[PDB]
RNA sequence: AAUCCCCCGUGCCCAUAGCGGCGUGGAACCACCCGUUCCCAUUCCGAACACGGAAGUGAAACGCGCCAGCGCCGAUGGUACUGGGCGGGCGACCGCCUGGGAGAGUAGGUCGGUGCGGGGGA
RNA sequence: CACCUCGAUGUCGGCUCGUCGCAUCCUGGGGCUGAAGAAGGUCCCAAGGGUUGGGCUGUUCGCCCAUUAAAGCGGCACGCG
RNA sequence: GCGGUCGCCUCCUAAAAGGUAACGGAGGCGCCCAAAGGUCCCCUCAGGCGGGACGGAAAUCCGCCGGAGAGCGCAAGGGUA
RNA sequence: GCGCUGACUGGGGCCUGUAGAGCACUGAUAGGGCUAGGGGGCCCACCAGCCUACCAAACCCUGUCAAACUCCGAAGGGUCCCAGGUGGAGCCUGGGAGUGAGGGCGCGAGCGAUAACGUCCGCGUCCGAGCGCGGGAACAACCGAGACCGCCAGCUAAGGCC
């Protein structure tokens, strides 16, 4: 069994994003935590990091997400970065993935 | 069982020329070294007829040395089916891979007078120690039976080492 | 005589014969063989006449091999006609044979016998030939 | 290390791009010698007509 | 079936093409006029 | 004879090679399938036709498993 | 921050990183897991997707190692072919010079390498 | 095939007159024979000469009658208006 | 002349850019689809083995194996999970 | 009119799928092996059923073939850049044309019969228009060689030197 709905859906949505040219607001979410990474392709380089497992916070992971959401803005917007795309990878734009995006407010956005 | 050759060294000189001068181009190689040489065609032929990638050639060669080499490929030009380049493989202390003749021994093998000898492979690929090198291999069983088959693990297999893949293959049958 | 059943395309160009025997080429089934010295198209009806000549001079045992096969469609107009309007028409099949190739090749017979058969068999061919035995060199595999 | 090229065999019946080289050099007549700068480009044409020219090395 | 569908005033006639006997209804769909902008557009003649 | 037909040669292929200077618009490759894929600053039309999106120069990229790519690296 | 080890992200190279066998890892990460109230769900199924949780397990997955049976990569010689230049044969075709030079096969090689960013260590 | 000839190279057969080739029909000379003899078969040498008259059909060709040492095959713009 | 052909697409011929002829080798078009169109979200085939009432080579189902040999309205090619 | 951009050549990048080879796909294909089912030959006619001296799928070896097959793949060719290259070179605008019946040869193919002084394309060349000169006995195109004029001077090319 080569490649999986996971790996597939992952490329599918992520490949489209990488065409538009913008900086990528990649979102990896785990069972316990949710992390966020602003990457620049063609330079193969990350610019602004913002995890929850790095901000040692907890209590309802939909609300944690938004926090690490707003956390990403602050750190980033202070580096000039304003406009970006927003990955979303394998995750449907919903719950804590949608939450973090809604948190990414106070920083460029359009999402 | 022991065959002497001779040899020389190559660097320049077009193989075309050597060829013209009765000499037969060729390379000498193994895990450690690789160098181009040339034998004498008239000489080499005499040896290889009997040698034949089955037995070991010692290869004299200035340098006074005497190198344990099997012949692992003979390129002969199709137009005259004569050889045009030999490449000699030199042995060291590490199990090699080779072809060993198959002394079809026994008899008409069961149901005698008669049956079918069914000759498949006058050789066989074996991973063996460069030290002990079987001159051939006894292939008897008894024999034998009618419509049977000596696979491969049924064969003698002297204290060389073992087979070379192909656990199950013809080698014997009567029909 | 001897044609290849089911063909993707009937009627094929003709190409040249500058080759030198793709291979081949080194005997691989019998004790003796007939090798092609010249390039030619060998006709199924030429092969069948070479085969028979041997099985015949072998009492009936015997053990040919042939090794060449007529897969090339040979065409030819209906004569008494002029160029243009379709192509040949197919009147048989040939095997392409450049020098080096081993045709036929026999086994399970004496030498003064196999060699006499191969000679006969050779007279049925439009090219010059050569009889071989098979030594180490042949064991090219 | 200037080169001395000299037309010795007629190009009547040779490809047109070869008559072009004999031109790129400046050779117009048989037996004509011409001494040119020995460079890669200038050698290209000299070896292209290598069968019609005779080359010597000069001061 | 060559088709020429129009708007709903001053005509218009921005022609398209419905091939068969189904769609066989009024064969209408929302389109845009050269005049104002985006209106119903129905099928006729 | 039942044969005799054929169609007009479609003059397909690459139109700009690597290290050629192009301009926004210049079509860079005419092809049937996606023999080449649109890279950086390279669009591709409904007939799979690749063209410069901006001015600049032409460079090719063989991403092995990922196929071959035509990029228009700017300079504008 | 330096160097380094492990882990999670994300790239790049695009099989020497792959298949398969064996062995390992749960403190931390990750997964599975525990539930289906709530957002949201499955043309049926909380399998998936999704949320809220965390007792348990590294069985599955994944990560890391080892093994060359397969897969993959693969010279060096030597040929085939051939720019250009010359010969030869009734031909079908063949040979020489000078430059370029495979394919198969042989010796071998390989069960990864590395960029940026995190978390944890020394 | 379409190369000279369409500001013309008259086309079958017969007649006439030939001439040449030999892959020889007869005659001369041979070898082999499954050649007793006589008579044949088959192949070799040999082109000097010879190689009939009729019926039928425009015919060439062929069938046929009567013979013969034999009733030769071809080329010469299917020789020759 | 008779026959066949006459425009368009695909493949080869075509000599590794493009182009390239013949009464050269073989096929196809003169439509079609209001969804077979746009976008967003999900999903991944064909086969092979084993398993399972009526189920048979093949209807639907479960298991493992399966990088594309399936599919993409119709020819061929290129393309594509 | 512009004027170093030209053919050709050196270096560099990119494009290609032929020659050759290969058999991984599409097909073709020799022998052997092992086995779907049938030819069968038959036991039954309830399971069945044994054997393969004809097949023959796949599968495995050993062997091969292909314009419309390619896991491979040269040499070459195309194009751009930077250089050399001053040439009856190049480019731009315009006046005048003629040609739109080609032919031989070499090489690469198709057609044909691996026939034609055949035919149809491709790349080259000459004749065409060099039926001017030398060689090839004589001979448009094979070899040599591009004839401005004169010389009772010299060196050579092919080819030759009884
Ligand atoms: Mg071979
Ligand atoms: Mg000449
Ligand atoms: Mg309109
Ligand atoms: Mg045509
Ligand atoms: Mg075409
Ligand atoms: Mg490439
Ligand atoms: Mg990772
Ligand atoms: Mg690969
Ligand atoms: Mg593994
Ligand atoms: Mg364990
Ligand atoms: Mg594991
Ligand atoms: Mg624990
Ligand atoms: Mg714990
Ligand atoms: Mg585990
Ligand atoms: Mg893990
Ligand atoms: Mg290799
Ligand atoms: Mg080499
Ligand atoms: Mg190689
Ligand atoms: Mg290792
Ligand atoms: Mg760190
Ligand atoms: Mg004429
Ligand atoms: Mg003509
Ligand atoms: Mg006149
Ligand atoms: Mg007159
Ligand atoms: Mg006679
Ligand atoms: Mg007589
Ligand atoms: Mg007598
Ligand atoms: Mg007599
Ligand atoms: Mg005589
Ligand atoms: Mg009359
Ligand atoms: Mg008569
Ligand atoms: Mg008559
Ligand atoms: Mg008479
Ligand atoms: Mg006469
Ligand atoms: Mg006549
Ligand atoms: Mg006459
Ligand atoms: Mg008259
Ligand atoms: Mg008359
Ligand atoms: Mg008509
Ligand atoms: Mg082309
Ligand atoms: Mg299935
Ligand atoms: Mg089943
Ligand atoms: Mg079943
Ligand atoms: Mg497909
Ligand atoms: Mg299709
Ligand atoms: Mg296709
Ligand atoms: Mg396809
Ligand atoms: Mg200049
Ligand atoms: Mg140019
Ligand atoms: Mg250049
Ligand atoms: Mg390729
Ligand atoms: Mg070929
Ligand atoms: Mg194959
Ligand atoms: Mg097949
Ligand atoms: Mg077989
Ligand atoms: Mg081919
Ligand atoms: Mg093709
Ligand atoms: Mg390769
Ligand atoms: Mg070039
Ligand atoms: Mg170049
Ligand atoms: Mg310049
Ligand atoms: Mg001019
Ligand atoms: Mg002008
Ligand atoms: Mg004008
Ligand atoms: Mg005209
Ligand atoms: Mg014309
Ligand atoms: Mg022409
Ligand atoms: Mg011309
Ligand atoms: Mg010409
Ligand atoms: Mg002539
Ligand atoms: Mg030649
Ligand atoms: Mg000819
Ligand atoms: Mg002609
Ligand atoms: Mg020429
Ligand atoms: Mg004229
Ligand atoms: Mg002349
Ligand atoms: Mg001229
Ligand atoms: Mg004259
Ligand atoms: Mg003359
Ligand atoms: Mg003369
Ligand atoms: Mg002359
Ligand atoms: Mg002059
Ligand atoms: Mg002069
Ligand atoms: Mg003199
Ligand atoms: Mg001389
Ligand atoms: Mg003379």
CB distance from B125 to chain C under 8 Å? no
CA of A108 to the centre of ligand 29 (A): 114
Distance, Å, B127 CA → G62 C1': 38
Domain that holds residue C60: 29-137
Q: How crowded is residue B104: how many other Cβ atoms within 10 Å of its Cβ? A: 15
> Coil, helix or strand for E38?
coil
**The tokens of B112 are what?**
């005698």
**The tokens of C60 are what?**
């009936």
Q: Please say whether the beta carbons of A88 and A54 come within 8 A.
A: no
In a domain, C56, yes or no: yes
Judge: C139–B52 Cβ closer than 8 Å, yes or no.
Answer: yes
- CA gap B124, A70 in Å, rounded: 73
- CA gap A37, A25 in Å, rounded: 6
In a domain, C22, yes or no: no
**The tokens of A49 are what?**
């990091």
In a domain, C45, yes or no: yes
The total number of structural domains in chain C stands at: 1
Chains adjacent to D (≥3 CB pairs closer than 8 angstroms) = none
- Resolution in Å, one decimal, please: 3.1
Q: Please say whether the beta carbons of E35 and E10 come within 8 A.
A: yes
Q: Please say whether the beta carbons of B171 and B151 come within 8 A.
A: yes
Distance, Å, A1 CA → I49 C1': 16
CA of C123 to the centre of ligand 29 (A): 30
CA–CA min distance C39, chain B (Å): 11
Q: Which ligand sits closest to the CA of A30?
A: 15
In a domain, C11, yes or no: no
Cis peptide leading into residue A36 (ω within 30°): no
CA–CA min distance B50, chain C (Å): 8
Nearest Cα to Cα of residue C114 among C44, C67, C63: C63
Taking CB atoms and an 8 Å cutoff, what residues of chain B touch C65? none
Q: How crowded is residue C18: how many other Cβ atoms within 10 Å of its Cβ? A: 7
In a domain, C58, yes or no: yes
**CATH number, residue C129:** 3.90.1170.10
In a domain, C54, yes or no: yes
Distance, Å, A4 CA → G59 C1': 22
CB distance from B48 to chain C under 8 Å? yes
Distances, alpha carbon F76 to alpha carbons F21, F56, F57, in Å: 11, 6, 9
In a domain, C15, yes or no: no
What's the first-to-final CA gap in chain A, in angstroms? Answer: 36
**The tokens of B121 are what?**
């492979």
Dump the DSSP string for C31-93. Answer: SEEEEE-S-EEEEHHHHHHHHHHHHHHTTT-----------EEPP---SS--S-SS------E
Positions on chain I within 7 A of a protein C-beta: 3-6, 8-14, 17-20, 22-28, 31-35, 41-44, 65-68, 77-81
In a domain, C60, yes or no: yes
Q: Please say whether the beta carbons of A41 and A20 come within 8 A.
A: no
For residue C63, count CB atoms less than 10 angstroms from its CB and return exposed for 0-12, middle for 13-18, buried for 19 or more.
middle
CA of D6 to the centre of ligand 84 (A): 21
Quick check: do A and D touch, 3+ CB pairs under 8 A? no
Q: Which residues pair with F38 in a beta bridge?
A: F70
Judge: C132–B76 Cβ closer than 8 Å, yes or no.
Answer: no
């Amino acid at each position: 069994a080569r490649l999986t709905a996971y790996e597939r859906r992952k490329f599918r949505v992520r490949n489209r994003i990488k065409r538009t040219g913008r900086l990528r607001l990649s979102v990896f979410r785990s069972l316990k935590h949710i992390y966020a990474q602003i990457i620049d392709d063609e330079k193969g380089v990350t610019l602004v990091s913002a995890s929850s497992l790095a901000l040692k916070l907890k209590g309802n992971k939909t609300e944690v997400a938004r926090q690490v959401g707003r956390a990403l803005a602050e750190k980033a917007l202070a580096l000039g970065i304003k406009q970006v795309a927003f990955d979303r990878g394998p995750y449907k734009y919903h719950g804590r993935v949608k939450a973090l995006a809604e948190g990414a407010r106070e920083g460029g956005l359009e999402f | 069982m022991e065959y002497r050759l001779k040899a020389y060294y190559r660097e320049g000189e077009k193989p075309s020329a050597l060829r013209r001068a009765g000499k037969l181009p060729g390379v000498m190689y193994n895990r450690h070294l690789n160098r181009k040489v040339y034998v004498d065609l008239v000489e080499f032929d005499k040896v290889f007829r009997q040698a034949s990638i089955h037995h070991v050639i010692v290869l004299e060669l200035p340098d006074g040395q005497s190198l344990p080499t099997l012949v692992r490929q003979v390129n002969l030009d199709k137009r005259r089916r004569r050889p045009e380049h030999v490449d000699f493989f030199v042995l060291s202390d590490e199990p090699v891979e080779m072809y060993v003749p198959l002394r079809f021994v026994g008899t008409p093998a069961g149901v005698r007078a008669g049956g079918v000898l069914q000759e498949i492979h006058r050789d066989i690929l074996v991973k063996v120690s460069p030290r002990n090198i079987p001159e051939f291999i006894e292939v008897d069983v008894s024999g034998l039976e009618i419509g049977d088959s000596l696979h491969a693990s049924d064969l003698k297999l002297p204290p060389g080492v073992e087979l070379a893949v192909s656990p199950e293959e013809t080698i014997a049958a009567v029909v | 005589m001897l044609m290849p059943r089911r063909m993707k395309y009937r009627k094929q160009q003709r190409g040249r014969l500058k080759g030198a025997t793709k291979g081949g080429d080194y005997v691989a089934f019998g004790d003796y063989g007939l090798v092609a010295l010249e390039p030619a198209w060998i006709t199924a009806q030429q092969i069948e006449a070479a085969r028979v000549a041997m099985v015949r001079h072998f009492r009936r045992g015997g053990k040919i091999f042939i090794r060449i096969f007529p897969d090339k469609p040979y065409t030819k107009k209906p004569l008494e006609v002029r160029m243009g309007k379709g192509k040949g028409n197919v009147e048989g099949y040939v095997a392409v044979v450049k020098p080096g190739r081993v045709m036929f090749e026999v086994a399970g017979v004496t030498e003064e016998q196999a060699m006499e058969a191969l000679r006969i068999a050779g007279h049925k061919l439009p090219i010059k030939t050569k009889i071989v035995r098979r030594d180490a060199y042949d064991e090219a595999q | 290390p200037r080169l001395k090229v000299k037309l010795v065999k007629s190009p009547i019946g040779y490809p047109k791009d070869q008559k072009a080289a004999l031109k790129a050099l400046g050779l117009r007549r048989l037996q004509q010698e011409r001494v040119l700068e020995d460079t890669p480009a200038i050698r290209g044409n000299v070896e292209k007509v290598a069968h019609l020219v005779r080359v010597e090395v000069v001061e | 079936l060559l088709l020429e569908c129009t708007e709903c005033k001053r005509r218009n006639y921005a022609t398209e093409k419905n091939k068969r006997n189904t769609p066989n209804k009024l064969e209408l769909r929302k389109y845009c006029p050269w005049c104002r902008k985006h209106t119903v557009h129905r099928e006729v003649k | 004879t039942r044969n005799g037909r054929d169609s007009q040669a479609k003059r397909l292929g690459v139109k700009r090679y690597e290290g050629q200077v192009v301009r926004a618009g210049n079509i860079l490759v005419r092809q049937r399938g996606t023999r080449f894929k649109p890279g950086k600053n390279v669009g591709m039309g409904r007939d799979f036709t690749l063209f410069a999106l901006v001015d600049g120069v032409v460079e090719f990229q063989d991403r092995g498993r990922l196929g071959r790519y035509v990029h228009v690296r700017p300079l504008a």
